[PDB]
Structures are given as structure tokens and as C-alpha cells.
């Protein structure tokens with residue numbers, strides 16, 4: 586019931602705070618299953634009224650919280666070069682650490698929960714949960730899907746513009762952050778039912794279909810330049826450092842962080 590659901594969300598929001606770059610949004614599993622299709626491979630095996638929380642990161646996750654974590658790890662390992670050698674997966678390591686701290690408190694409020702990440706997969710490499718769909722049904726961010734922007738006798742999107750095993754995918758836009766955010770995790774509480782809860786509708790960000798199609802092209806074809814993130818004209822944005830980091834392949838990223846821990850000062 587709903588006081589308990591609110592107490593659960595409160596612990597999450599205490600330990601994964603807005604200031605450090607997290608948000609949470611409540612939704613019902615039934616809303617997700619209705620959207621993906623009740624018989625789709627993505628349908629989740631919980632009753633319709635089961636409580637879930639979507640956790641997303643905002644610009645300060647990287648710029649503030651992760652920066653603090655990298656500074657500390659550098660101190661712990663003794664040098665930046667040592668951290669780089671020993672921590673191949675810094676973003677996921679940071680998130681795992683923060684989620685464990687949260688979970689230690691959350692277990693005392695509701696002991697039974699499952700956690701699915703944006704990167705979680707089955708052994709067949711199917712994503713376990715579709716985050717943009719969660720974001721839309723939870724009202725967190727409007728999900729712009731290519732299949733919703735077709736025109737009769739128009740071939741859009743182009744075919745064969747992207748590399749192997751890549752599809753032309755949709756894009757969610759947040760009402761504060763545009764594309765300067767990411768989905769991170771969903772917590773599912775199988776023993777907590779919230780049938781009376783009504784999710785808010787996601788705010789429309791792009792109202793003209795030609796802007797949507799342009800945004801989707803910028804995302805699929807040009808994402809390294811982060812232009813897609815500025816649709817909706819957000820004022821709260823990823824830093825330059827953060828856009829450089831996520832625009833690079835993982836093997837080239839650590840050097841972007843060197844100044845955080847090796848510079849006496851900045852100028």
C-alpha cells in the first residue's frame with residue numbers, strides 16, 4: 586500500500602540524491618507490460634499492480650558524484666595510473682557502489698526487491714528491461730519512437746545508414762535535461778502493490794514531427810557530438826568533460842579524467 590510505497594521511494598531518494606545526480610520515478614509493472622505487449626518477450630513476470638521505481642542519472646551524477654568517487658579511488662590505489670589499471674569499468678563500479686549503499690538501507694524498509702540495469706541482459710543478449718518505455722510510462726521522459734513518425738509513401742528513416750547490428754532507435758527527452766541524462770536502474774518490489782497509483786503523463790518536448798525526425802537522425806548518426814541532447818533547449822546540461830567522456834570508446838576515456846585527480850589547479 587501507498588504509505589509503504591512512499592517510504593520505499595523516500596529511502597531511495599535519500600541515498601541516491603537529486604543533488605548528486607539521481608532521480609526516481611514510480612510506476613506499475615502493468616503499465617510497462619501494456620506498453621511492450623503482454624505477450625512480448627519483454628513482458629515482466631509480476632502482477633499488474635506491482636510497484637517499480639525507475640532510477641535515472643542527471644548531469645551531476647558524472648560531474649559531481651562520480652568525480653568524488655574517482656578522487657577517492659585514486660587516493661586508495663595510490664595513483665591515477667593504478668586506478669586506470671585496476672578499474673576497467675569505472676562508471677559501473679561507481680554505480681554498483683552507490684546502489685549497494687542504497688540497498689543496505691532499503692532492505693530495512695522492504696527486504697524483497699529485484700534490480701535491473703539499463704545494461705542487464707539475458708544470455709541471448711536481450712535487454713531485461715526497456716528503459717525508454719519505463720521512462721515514458723512513468724512520466725519521466727517522453728519517448729520518441731521512429732515507428733510513431735512514419736508518413737504515407739515516405740521512406741523514413743533511411744535504410745542501411747548504420748553499422749552492423751545497429752538499428753535506428755528512438756530517443757527519450759527529459760523535461761529539465763533534454764538528452765543530458767541516462768536511465769540507470771529499475772527496482773521491482775514484488776510484495777508491494779499500488780493499484781490506486783496513477784503515473785503522470787510524460788511532458789511533450791518536441792511538438793513538431795520534423796524536429797522529432799531531425800533529433801532522431803542526430804542521435805543515431807551523430808551522437809558523438811551530443812547535439813541530440815540539446816533538443817528541448819535544456820539549461821541543465823552535461824559538462825564538456827562529460828560529453829567528451831561519453832563520446833569516446835571506453836578504452837580512450839580514462840585520460841579524460843586525469844585532470845580531476847592530477848591537477849594542482851585549473852586554468
Ligand code: COB
Pocket residue numbers: 620621622625627702703704705712713714715716717718721722728730750751752753754755756757758764766767768769804805806808831832
Ligand atoms: C528493443 C527495442 C530497441 N531498443 C534497444 O534494443 C535498446 C536497448 C539498450 C540496451 C538501451 C537500454 C535499455 N535497457 O533499454 C540503450 N542502448 Co544504447 C546504450 N545502445 C545499444 C546498442 C545498440 C544501439 C543501436 N543503435 O542499435 C549499443 C550498445 C551499440 C548502444 C549504443 C548507444 N546507446 C546510447 C544511448 C545514450 C542509449 N542507449 C539506450 C537506448 C539508452 C536508453 C540507455 C540509457 N542508459 O539511458 C540510451 C538513450 C537514452 C535516451 N535519452 O533515450 C549511446 C549514445 C551511448 C554512448 N554514449 O555511447 C550509443 C549510441 C546510440 C545509438 N543511437 O546508436 C542498446 C541495445 C541499448 O526497443 P523499442 O523501444 O524499439 O521496442 C519496444 C517494444 C518492445 O516490444 O514495445 C515498446 N512499445 C510498443 N508500443 C509502445 C511501446 C512503448 C511505449 C512507451 C508506447 C507508448 C507504445 C517499444 O516500442
